[PDB]
Ligand binder design. Structure first.
Ligand SMILES: *[C@@H]1O[C@H](CO)[C@@H](O[C@@H]2O[C@H](CO)[C@@H](O[C@@H]3O[C@H](CO)[C@@H](O)[C@H](O)[C@@H]3O)[C@H](O)[C@H]2NC(C)=O)[C@H](O[C@@H]2O[C@@H](C)[C@@H](O)[C@@H](O)[C@@H]2O)[C@H]1NC(C)=O
Ligand SMILES: *[C@@H]1O[C@H](CO)[C@@H](O)[C@H](O)[C@H]1NC(C)=O
Ligand SMILES: [Cl-]
Ligand SMILES: [Cl-]
Lengths: 164, 164
């Protein structure tokens, strides 16, 4: 029921507090975005900015579970020079790997999968498009009060809302 | 001088018809942009969309001539999932190499230089950030009635107008 190329909001399974790339939150053009995190919109809870899933297998109209895909933010506004494509980067101040935008389609570090998590789903990131994959969850360390997505093997249960 | 991190319009030395990434001319969301050309705004001539130059030593305040740099489009609107960073791609439809957006900062394929050319300048693209470089000029083949930038060793003389 997740469709290739269609925008969805990623939301926590039990919450209305969705997610946005940092650059879209800050409303300001910058000359580079070395660590454009995906952060939760909490005060008040806001739906965030949708993403699109692109399976590694290009013929697929339905996004399969447990299979390599790219994610990218769907937004006509963009305040970074880098891409809208999600990837993972290491950050010393955030105490390890974090999800960011600025990736490259079909690159070795670009691969995520959607998996079942109880009655919901979870996102995982798969280095080099292979297992072992790390669960994507919410972290706070180094986030200056914000909650950001990171592949640290603690899953955040998510639901998808079609953005149409 | 040409200043780092300051937006400039690239213009032909003797014309007001500047340049824009194709996705900005279309002004609608795209699922992907495999070949986002930089095309000339001719009829009527319009100044285009500015760019920012980032020298390979990104700490320099003046952009050096004859020295590797990245170029990216300066725009808050962006209709592609891929980056605003310039690169070169092969296109059989366009009978060879073409300038496009969707590059990656500091990547092998990302390097251009600004060189003096007569009393004006030219852009060159430098495979792997090394010489020899190929002069960037204007082409029409496969362009559907538009002119696009391509590194085919016939230089377009250009000037740079600071955007404000
Ligand atoms: C070229 O493309 C851009 C980006 O799509 C257009 O700007 C966008 O126009 C929308 C209207 O078609 C604006 O949507 C409104 O947003 C608010 C708040 O989210 C809603 O409450 C409201 O009901 C609309 O949905 C959108 O904000 C705007 N985006 C940006 C970043 O500016 C642009 O349209 C032109 O400018 C804007 C400001 C509008 O006034 C349009 O009517 C106008 O055509 C497109 N340009 C052209 C020439 O078509
Ligand atoms: C960005 O714009 C939104 C919507 O106008 C606003 O509510 C928010 O506080 C702004 N963020 C910053 C950092 O200015
Ligand atoms: Cl990972
Ligand atoms: Cl070249």
């Amino acid at each position: 029921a997740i469709l290739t190329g269609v925008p969805y909001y990623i939301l926590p399974s039990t919450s209305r507090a969705g997610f946005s790339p940092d650059n879209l939150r800050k409303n300001t053009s910058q000359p580079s975005c070395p660590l454009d995190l995906i952060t939760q919109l909490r005060f008040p809870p806001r739906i965030g900015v949708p993403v699109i899933f692109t399976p590694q297998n290009s013929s697929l109209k339905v996004v399969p579970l447990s299979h390599n895909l790219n994610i990218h933010t769907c937004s006509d506004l963009w305040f970074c020079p880098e891409s809208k494509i999600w990837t993972v980067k290491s950050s010393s101040i955030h105490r390890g790997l974090v999800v960011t935008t600025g990736g490259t389609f079909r690159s070795l570090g670009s691969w995520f999968r959607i998996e079942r998590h109880g009655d919901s789903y979870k996102l995982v990131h798969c280095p080099r498009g292979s297992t072992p994959c790390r669960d994507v969850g919410i972290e706070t360390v180094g986030g200056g009060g914000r909650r950001y997505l990171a592949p640290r093997d603690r899953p955040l249960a998510v639901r998808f809302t079609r953005a149409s």
